[model samples]
Target: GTITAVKGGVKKQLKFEDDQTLFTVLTEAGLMSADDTCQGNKACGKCICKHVSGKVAAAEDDEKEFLEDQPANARLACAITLSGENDGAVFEL
Candidate 1:
């Protein structure tokens, strides 16, 4: 699967092996900065991003609560498992 990630006003393109999560992909691509301190823990809100396009699963409990007032498309990067559901997804942070 592939993903187009937007962070800090810079866009980066990446490819991934099956079943990788967005957090993993972003860190591997070096797109995840030091400010993304929580990594995939979902404890801090630093990894939040908007699911701009394509398909992704519905947000889980923690993700839902954290992103509640943001936007319908907002989700926590750590909580998202990049299944075939979002094979060609686009995300903005």
Candidate 2:
């Protein structure tokens, strides 16, 4: 799968490993520098992104409870799987 997004003034295309998490691709693409702590784990909501236009499963209970204030688009890159219950998901910038 592939993820496409634009940041700053550049657009980035990220390849999703068959077993990779969204975190890996986003961080590698410089979309997120990542928090110094938590090493990009979903434990930190710093790398969160809102889904402008696409499909994504709701966060797990743990993350949902912690991120209650986040809108539907607010998803933690780390915990998002490419091969999840949903596929061909898209996100708006």
Candidate 3:
């Protein structure tokens, strides 16, 4: 499985692991920086990104509430679990 991230006008892809959340993968891939917020505590909506392709676990209660004000495709990276449901998933920062 894979997660593709589009940030700062650049796109990158990384191998996906079952135990990891999109937040971990994105930060580990260097797409997201520590100083940019999103410490994975879901404290703020900074980690929100648009899911361009692929299916992940349905949003949790808090995630649902947080995403309510976002676009239809928007999801919080820290709240999403890649299910490998469709192989390749795209998340835009």
Candidate 4:
């Protein structure tokens, strides 16, 4: 199965192994659209993603503060770990 990466008006389905985060997957693809200012600390909103479809992990406290103004679908990529359920999930960078 695959997840999707949406960037600059483009959507690309990307393959991944189990238990991967958008940060790891995008980094491997050399398409790290989400900034890495926090290095996966979940503090910076630089890694924020616009959720388009499919299931993503629920946000915790770190996400709420960083993405306070964003919609529910806006998730921090480094924090949204992927699963088989996350397959076909669309996240816009």
lDDT of every model, 2 decimals: 0.79, 0.65, 0.79, 0.79
Across residues 1-93, which tens digit of lDDT does each residue of candidate 1 receive? Answer: 788898888878788777777888887777765363776888886776788888888887877888877777788877888876677889997
Q: For residue 57, what is the lDDT in candidate 4?
A: 71
Could you give the candidate ranking by TM-score, starting with the highest? 4, 3, 1, 2
Instruction: Give candidate 4 regions above 4 Å deviation.
Output: 33-36
Each candidate's clash count: 0, 2, 0, 0
Candidate 2 lDDT by residue in tens digits, 1-93: 676665664666666776677777777776777657376666766666655545666679866754678775677777777764334565433
Position 87, candidate 2: lDDT: 44
Best by TM-score: 4
Pairs in clash, predicted candidate 3: none
Q: For model 4, how does the per-residue alpha-carbon lDDT over 1-93 read when each residue is reduced to its tens digit?
A: 699898888888899878777877886786675444776667677777788888877788867788888876788778877788888888877
Tally clashes: model 3.
Answer: 0
Clashing pairs in 4: none
As for candidate 2, its clashing pairs are 50-73, 51-73
List TM-score per model, in order: 0.81, 0.75, 0.82, 0.84
Better of 1 and 2 by lDDT: 1
